[PDB]
């Protein structure tokens, strides 16, 4: 493949070029709107982002080398994690605010519940990125790791394919270290920062799980409509 033959700088440029655009929501500050409407905006926003995410994922090195059925599984597992880390990244320079879109900045004040719970976690993660001074180059690495890692253990010889993923994941680790070394970090600092970044993925998984449960019960109430795609992405997770 080409993914395995890429230098660290090529990998970065590839990931940077593959970045999805920042979409706008339909937020109108004159609309009084409740909170079945707020979740409507976010749902509409997520549904449009998903179309860009799928096309972004096809440009993540190594991803298209996978069978279609494995591409599907990876995205089904990681879609909310990926939207959330994007949200957290966009919100870095807005303390106490979540930039869902340029025209949609929400603080914890407005936002229901178990909803505020998730908001707080997203805010804390954003606070975390800010204090670490996370770089854009590091962000795209982390986001691709999520895509490739999150569903890898829920998939003969479909085993050899798990290995191609592990090889690409190893390359992204190489790329991250390369960036930190170029930033002037000592060896101890590179390793520590690498760990710090990956531990955050545990928290992003946690927020995704909790978010998926909130989305599932929101669906059963049928006060807000989930898009056709979101319903199918949601079905892949089941519960409860």
């Amino acid at each position: 493949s080409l993914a395995l033959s890429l230098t660290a700088d090529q990998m970065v440029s590839a990931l940077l070029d593959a970045e999805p655009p920042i979409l706008y929501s339909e937020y109108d500050p004159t609309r009084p709107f409740s909170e079945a409407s707020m979740m409507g905006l976010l749902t509409n926003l997520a549904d449009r982002e998903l179309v860009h995410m799928i096309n972004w994922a096809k440009r993540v090195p190594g991803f298209v080398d996978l069978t279609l059925h494995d591409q599907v599984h990876l995205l089904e597992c990681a879609w909310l994690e990926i939207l959330m880390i994007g949200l957290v990244w966009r919100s870095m320079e807005h303390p106490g605010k979540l930039l869902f879109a340029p025209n949609l900045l929400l603080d914890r004040n407005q936002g229901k519940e178990g909803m505020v719970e998730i908001f707080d976690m997203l805010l804390a993660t954003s606070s975390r990125f800010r204090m670490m001074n996370l770089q854009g180059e590091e962000f795209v690495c982390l986001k691709s790791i999520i895509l490739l890692n999150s569903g890898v253990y829920t998939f003969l010889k479909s085993l050899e394919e798990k290995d191609h993923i592990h090889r690409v994941l190893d390359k992204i680790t190489d790329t991250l270290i390369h960036l930190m070394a170029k930033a002037g970090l000592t060896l101890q600092q590179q390793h520590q920062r690498l760990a710090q970044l990956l531990l955050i993925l545990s928290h992003i998984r946690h927020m995704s799980n909790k978010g998926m449960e909130h989305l599932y019960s929101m669906k059963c109430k049928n006060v807000v409509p989930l898009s056709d795609l979101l319903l199918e992405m949601l079905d892949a997770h089941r519960l409860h």
Binding site: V51, I54, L68, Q71, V72, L75, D228, L229, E232
Partner: peptide, 10 residues
């Protein structure tokens, strides 16, 4: 098949 399956294929 699924929408995701379709969009990936296209």
């Amino acid at each position: 098949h699924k929408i995701l399956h379709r969009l990936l294929q296209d």
